[PDB]
Amino acid sequence: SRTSMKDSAGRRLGPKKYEGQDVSTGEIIMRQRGTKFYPGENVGIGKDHSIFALEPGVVRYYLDPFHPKRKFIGVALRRDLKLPSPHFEPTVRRFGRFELTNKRAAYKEENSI
Amino acid sequence: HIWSDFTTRPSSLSIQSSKVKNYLFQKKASLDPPSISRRSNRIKYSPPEHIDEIFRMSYDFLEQRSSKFYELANKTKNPLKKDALLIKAEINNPEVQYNFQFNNKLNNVKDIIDYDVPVYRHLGKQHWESYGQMLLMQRLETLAAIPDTLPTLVPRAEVNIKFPFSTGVNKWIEPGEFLSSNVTSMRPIFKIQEYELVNVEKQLYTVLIVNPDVPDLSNDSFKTALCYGLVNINLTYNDNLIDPRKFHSSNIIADYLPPVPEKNAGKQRFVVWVFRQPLIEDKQGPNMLEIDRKELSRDDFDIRQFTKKYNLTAIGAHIWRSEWDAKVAAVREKYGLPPGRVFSRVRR
Amino acid sequence: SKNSVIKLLSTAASGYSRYISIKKGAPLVTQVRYDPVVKRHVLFKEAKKRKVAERKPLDFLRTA
Amino acid sequence: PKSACSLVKPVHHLVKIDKSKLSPRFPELKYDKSDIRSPGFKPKDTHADRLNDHYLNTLQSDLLLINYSHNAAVVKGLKQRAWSGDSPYHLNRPPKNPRGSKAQLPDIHPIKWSNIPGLESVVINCFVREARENQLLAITAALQLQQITGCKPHPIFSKNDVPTWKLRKGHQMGAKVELKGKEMSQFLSTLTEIVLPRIREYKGISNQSGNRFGGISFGLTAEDIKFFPEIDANQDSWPKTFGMHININTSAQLDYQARTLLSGFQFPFFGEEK
Amino acid sequence: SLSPLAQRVVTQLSVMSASRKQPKLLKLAREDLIKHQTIEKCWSIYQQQQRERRNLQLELQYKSIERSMNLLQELSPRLFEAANASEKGKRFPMEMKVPTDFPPNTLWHYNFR
Amino acid sequence: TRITLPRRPAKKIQLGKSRPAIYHQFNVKMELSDGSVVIRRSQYPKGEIRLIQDQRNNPLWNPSRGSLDRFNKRYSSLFSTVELSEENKKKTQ
RNA sequence: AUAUAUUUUAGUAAUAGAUAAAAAUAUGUACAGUAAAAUUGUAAGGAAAACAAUAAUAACUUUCUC
RNA sequence: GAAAGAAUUAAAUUAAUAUAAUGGUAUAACUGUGCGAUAAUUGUAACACAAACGAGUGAAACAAGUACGUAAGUAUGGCA
Ligand SMILES: [Mg+2]
Ligand SMILES: [Mg+2]
Ligand SMILES: [Mg+2]
Ligand SMILES: [Mg+2]
Ligand SMILES: [Mg+2]
Ligand SMILES: [Mg+2]
């Protein structure tokens, strides 16, 4: 006899973060083999086509008319925003830094070049 | 022979250099080109054979065509059509081609390239479309100065800026340049070169330099800042350099505040926009407009809202972008602005 | 053994060195990489000696 | 590489950015090849083309007159058929391929003053099959082609592999040359006058030859090439000589129109037409 | 090193090649360049005009044919039918030759068949 | 086994610097079978050629309009139609 | 026309185009383009070597012209 | 009315992807070409995915240096 008793395990390749879900920077929204979902707004894409969040926000799945026949995952900076954002409106940006109210810290920062 | 006549036609259509003109129009290939300044090089040079007679024939052909066009041009009443006819007549003139190609378009001398003349203006427009306009568009799109400030641009006027008063050096700013705080310490100089047919006497303009990237920590985002605001400026095709000479203190809706980027706040886009005024009929002379100076604010400035209010149309744009350096504190001190904030290096 | 290991020693004489793999008869492998002792990009060269598959030096000067 | 995800970003303006012009890399390349300042400059309209002039004067009007069919409407070709929506599986389904063919066929227009048939291009494909043994034979064939045309040939390489015929893949084997405009016209004139009459039992081009749409072809043996005046003048210099295929491409809607056009330029046609 | 056949092949190759056979680049003065441009542009315009003239003439001929055929259809149906036949295998006569540079010894043949 | 010319390193034609192959060509006069001359540009150095067998003397191109030679030469006194009629009895075949 | 001297040419070798599905540098970046099959043909060529051809132009810009 | 350009629409990922099979890829990840041969570099790597541990995977950001690109930027080996 000779049996075909050999197989790899399942690659855990679902969506790891869902519509309306809060995200943090670095977090993986999708694991996939090839771009089933394309990286949308405020979202990066890795070597393994893994969509990850570039900013803190709300994960949103959407279609964009500019790219028909392509699904997108992006991260809205608030829950208020429809994440296929209006084209000619200005981009919702995050400053994401804090001023150094502390005097010593500010001085150190000024010194550093 | 319409192109030899200068009774009704401007002086600019001729070549001002006499030697060059003589070289162009001779009966044999005897003379040597004025372009080649050096004797040895002239000796070395040999122009292609038979070029003269054929050239003369071509001139005659195109001169005839121009004359025919002129027959139509004078009968025409409406202005844009007339201008187009004039362009058609003179665009193939060798002399005007020589003038345009081989002399400066930016700081045009009126006798050589007159932008009051329609043909020369058309040529200048074409030149702008070929390179400078495309570049400007690229810099607006890539840096994200269009959607962030003002939705779109349909580039009509070529806008070039300069910073003569601060340092001393002469340099037209390439769009999307990084300028030092020393360079942009004092105000800039605009040159709004208009290529469309427009009423020079009536048409006024406004110029707004806006900084979309100043950080607002309440919103955790950015806000706009009107760094320099002029209104009701008069341009002329040749007389178009917007300098403290031209505009009065009444024209300044918001007088120049310099780029003073904060440490680690990032790179700050400064995108000048040039709008033309709405032109009112049944009113001789330039129609002014009053700006509510308490209503518009400098620390936060809705450009789009402002445009909507005064019914402006953005014809031109230019952009530089400043970031923090050692001298920004000195600039602030000179202007009497406060010490200036310092942010964390990490965008956490 | 088809692919052998080699030691690339930094040309700026720090002592820093990086190791890479090559085919047995591959050309001499020099590469410019960051030397952290010197804090710059420097040339690396093979410290040891080894035999090479001798390619005919292609002649740009048109011979004969 | 952090990723392979290709995704062109949309823009916020309608100006067409020519990216080539914004660089300062290839200043000679910014000029058109027609422009004198380009190193690629070549005098195009050097002398009056004779065959072309003849076509313009005599033939074109005659051809138009021939091809007039009264109130002739357009004949649509075989195209990809859409599905009837009589099932919800038709909803994003690709269209059925054409009726007879796998590839779509073009519409045949009525001939009017605009779309009169005329010569478009000649291509002279010479694939020498002995060059599977000897690469130098390909070179000689290319030279011959150049001599014949006065135009630069392009080398043909073996695209396929096969054992029965001793043929490798990626081996230089003969050459080709697409003639266009005045050189092509000259070549046709030479064919009509010098070469094809010196072929002994030459009936003509077959009427069964051709594409379905405005393309006619034939071939010359190695015996026939020695009648070309460039080859004939030095028979010592040309010991070997290679046959060739000659693809004539017309601006004809159909093949009978193309045949008629070629006849106008003194090409004989012998076989029973389709 | 090389055979006589190899040598002859090399010579043949050289005939086709641009190696050390081509002159210097055609440089012009600015005035000369302008003159050239004006020559070329004018020529191009002339060619366009000629094309339009010929094209116009062809259009006029087509219109005349259309006018004729309608009239024929109106008057005599049989004549119209005869006119409007498929001329699929129509061949230009072999006497209508492509006009040479200079004429032959016998300009015209008065007898035939 | 395969006869070849082995390639040297190729010369780098830079982008923009590529020049079109304008081969050396002479204006050559072809006189056809009849006296009709035609000018054609040609690469071989010969200003004038006169052709013997052309379309202008081929029957296919105008329908409306040396062993044999040796034989004629050495059977000339006999003068070899009448001769055909004499030597053509079609009974035997 | 011919002699000597001093040079110059002839080492004859392919890409001429940002080349684009013959073969060849498999990682970077910048710019650009589209394959395949099947069908109709064509010198040896044949089911199977190579080359050609095979969906639609409404609107827009420029040019010439009635 | 004609010529040229810009192109758009339809179709296609059946070819091609160093290599199995699957998913992805013409907006090309496929192919050609210039430069290059550098990022098949150096210290800190949060946060995620996966996950008994040992390991494995994607990776923002900070700092040093390099290559290409007018620029925007891209590159810490290869469509996965
Ligand atoms: Mg599994
Ligand atoms: Mg697949
Ligand atoms: Mg878990
Ligand atoms: Mg662990
Ligand atoms: Mg790969
Ligand atoms: Mg790759």
PDB file of N, CA and C (backbone and C1' of nucleotides) and ligand atoms in Angstrom, chain G residues 26-27, chain H residues 17-18 29-31 78-80, ligand 5:
ATOM      1  P     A G  26      17.778  38.533 -14.869  1.00  0.00           P
ATOM      2  O5'   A G  26      17.188  39.564 -13.803  1.00  0.00           O
ATOM      3  C5'   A G  26      15.774  39.671 -13.539  1.00  0.00           C
ATOM      4  C4'   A G  26      15.374  38.882 -12.309  1.00  0.00           C
ATOM      5  C3'   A G  26      16.153  39.164 -11.017  1.00  0.00           C
ATOM      6  O3'   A G  26      15.296  39.390  -9.896  1.00  0.00           O
ATOM      7  C1'   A G  26      16.034  36.840 -11.406  1.00  0.00           C
ATOM      8  P     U G  27      14.256  40.621  -9.881  1.00  0.00           P
ATOM      9  O5'   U G  27      14.593  41.370  -8.517  1.00  0.00           O
ATOM     10  C5'   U G  27      14.463  40.708  -7.248  1.00  0.00           C
ATOM     11  C4'   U G  27      15.305  41.397  -6.199  1.00  0.00           C
ATOM     12  C3'   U G  27      15.326  42.918  -6.232  1.00  0.00           C
ATOM     13  O3'   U G  27      14.137  43.522  -5.727  1.00  0.00           O
ATOM     14  C1'   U G  27      17.529  42.132  -6.011  1.00  0.00           C
TER      15        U G  27
ATOM     16  P     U H  17       7.068  33.085 -17.045  1.00  0.00           P
ATOM     17  O5'   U H  17       6.744  33.913 -15.725  1.00  0.00           O
ATOM     18  C5'   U H  17       7.435  35.145 -15.453  1.00  0.00           C
ATOM     19  C4'   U H  17       6.896  35.794 -14.200  1.00  0.00           C
ATOM     20  C3'   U H  17       7.289  35.114 -12.891  1.00  0.00           C
ATOM     21  O3'   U H  17       8.016  35.964 -12.001  1.00  0.00           O
ATOM     22  C1'   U H  17       4.932  35.485 -12.978  1.00  0.00           C
ATOM     23  P     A H  18       9.571  36.304 -12.269  1.00  0.00           P
ATOM     24  O5'   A H  18      10.170  34.933 -12.817  1.00  0.00           O
ATOM     25  C5'   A H  18      10.122  33.748 -12.009  1.00  0.00           C
ATOM     26  C4'   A H  18      11.056  32.691 -12.535  1.00  0.00           C
ATOM     27  C3'   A H  18      10.669  31.279 -12.098  1.00  0.00           C
ATOM     28  O3'   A H  18      10.058  30.628 -13.210  1.00  0.00           O
ATOM     29  C1'   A H  18      12.807  31.846 -11.235  1.00  0.00           C
ATOM     30  P     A H  29       3.832  46.630 -11.486  1.00  0.00           P
ATOM     31  O5'   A H  29       3.919  45.078 -11.134  1.00  0.00           O
ATOM     32  C5'   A H  29       5.128  44.507 -10.599  1.00  0.00           C
ATOM     33  C4'   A H  29       4.879  43.097 -10.112  1.00  0.00           C
ATOM     34  C3'   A H  29       4.332  42.122 -11.154  1.00  0.00           C
ATOM     35  O3'   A H  29       4.898  40.828 -10.978  1.00  0.00           O
ATOM     36  C1'   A H  29       2.820  42.272  -9.354  1.00  0.00           C
ATOM     37  P     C H  30       6.249  40.433 -11.734  1.00  0.00           P
ATOM     38  O5'   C H  30       5.782  40.293 -13.250  1.00  0.00           O
ATOM     39  C5'   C H  30       5.047  39.138 -13.691  1.00  0.00           C
ATOM     40  C4'   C H  30       4.767  39.195 -15.176  1.00  0.00           C
ATOM     41  C3'   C H  30       5.860  39.777 -16.062  1.00  0.00           C
ATOM     42  O3'   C H  30       6.847  38.806 -16.397  1.00  0.00           O
ATOM     43  C1'   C H  30       3.796  40.772 -16.621  1.00  0.00           C
ATOM     44  P     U H  31       8.362  39.253 -16.679  1.00  0.00           P
ATOM     45  O5'   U H  31       8.234  40.195 -17.958  1.00  0.00           O
ATOM     46  C5'   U H  31       8.061  39.637 -19.273  1.00  0.00           C
ATOM     47  C4'   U H  31       7.900  40.725 -20.310  1.00  0.00           C
ATOM     48  C3'   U H  31       9.058  41.698 -20.465  1.00  0.00           C
ATOM     49  O3'   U H  31      10.153  41.140 -21.185  1.00  0.00           O
ATOM     50  C1'   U H  31       7.036  42.903 -20.436  1.00  0.00           C
ATOM     51  P     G H  78      11.122  40.809  -0.885  1.00  0.00           P
ATOM     52  O5'   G H  78      11.135  40.320  -2.399  1.00  0.00           O
ATOM     53  C5'   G H  78      11.168  41.270  -3.477  1.00  0.00           C
ATOM     54  C4'   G H  78      11.524  40.584  -4.770  1.00  0.00           C
ATOM     55  C3'   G H  78      10.470  39.634  -5.327  1.00  0.00           C
ATOM     56  O3'   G H  78      10.566  39.714  -6.746  1.00  0.00           O
ATOM     57  C1'   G H  78      12.445  38.434  -4.909  1.00  0.00           C
ATOM     58  P     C H  79       9.328  39.337  -7.676  1.00  0.00           P
ATOM     59  O5'   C H  79       8.101  40.064  -6.969  1.00  0.00           O
ATOM     60  C5'   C H  79       6.783  39.932  -7.518  1.00  0.00           C
ATOM     61  C4'   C H  79       5.741  40.092  -6.441  1.00  0.00           C
ATOM     62  C3'   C H  79       5.703  38.992  -5.390  1.00  0.00           C
ATOM     63  O3'   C H  79       6.620  39.258  -4.332  1.00  0.00           O
ATOM     64  C1'   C H  79       3.543  39.285  -6.277  1.00  0.00           C
ATOM     65  P     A H  80       7.241  38.053  -3.477  1.00  0.00           P
ATOM     66  O5'   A H  80       5.981  37.490  -2.683  1.00  0.00           O
ATOM     67  C5'   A H  80       5.366  38.253  -1.630  1.00  0.00           C
ATOM     68  C4'   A H  80       4.144  37.540  -1.102  1.00  0.00           C
ATOM     69  C3'   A H  80       4.388  36.149  -0.529  1.00  0.00           C
ATOM     70  O3'   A H  80       4.878  36.288   0.801  1.00  0.00           O
ATOM     71  C1'   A H  80       2.497  36.104  -1.955  1.00  0.00           C
TER      72        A H  80
HETATM   73 MG    MG I   5       9.308  37.580  -9.518  1.00  0.00          MG
END
